[PDB]
Amino acid sequence: ETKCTLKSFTVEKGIYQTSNFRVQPTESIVRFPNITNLCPFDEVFNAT
Amino acid sequence: DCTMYICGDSTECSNLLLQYGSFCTQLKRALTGIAVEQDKNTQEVFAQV
Numbered sequence: 126e127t128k129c130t131l132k133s134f135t136v137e138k139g140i141y142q143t144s145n146f147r148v149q150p151t152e153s154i155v156r157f158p159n160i161t162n163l164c165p166f167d168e169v170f171n172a173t
Numbered sequence: 174d175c176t177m178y179i180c181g182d183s184t185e186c187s188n189l190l191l192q193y194g195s196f197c198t199q200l201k202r203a204l205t206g207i208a209v210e211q212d213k214n215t216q217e218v219f220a221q222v
């Protein structure tokens with residue numbers, strides 16, 4: 126990791142830094158669970 | 174850290190940021206020189222005996 130961060134095959138003694146640490150997400154989620162207020166189309170399409 | 178500050182938690186800037194190449198790897202070398210040099214100043218003020 127520190128070899129390819131410095132773009133070299135050799136490293137000298139010392140302290141270095143690399144790509145920062147991060148916890149990746151795992152799943153995916155959604156919203157708007159309750160849906161109501163359906164449009165009154167039945168009487169339009171099924172009136173006697 | 175250049176990656177998180179600009180386009181953290183993003184998989185779309187990750188590849189896109191490489192299009193600019195060698196910007197944010199240049200900044201780290203600039204600040205790392207300052208931080209390393211900071212300890213030297215305290216060395217020159219107390220470590221005389």
Ligand SMILES: *[C@@H]1O[C@H](CO)[C@@H](O[C@@H]2O[C@H](CO)[C@@H](O)[C@H](O)[C@H]2NC(C)=O)[C@H](O)[C@H]1NC(C)=O
Pocket residue numbers: 158159160
């Ligand atoms: C309509 O919205 C309400 C607002 O939360 C929902 O009420 C609760 O929903 C949770 C999760 O769906 C249930 O565990 C609870 O039992 C619900 N409360 C009651 C008093 O039953 C409600 O579920 C939504 N309607 C539908 C059909 O999901």
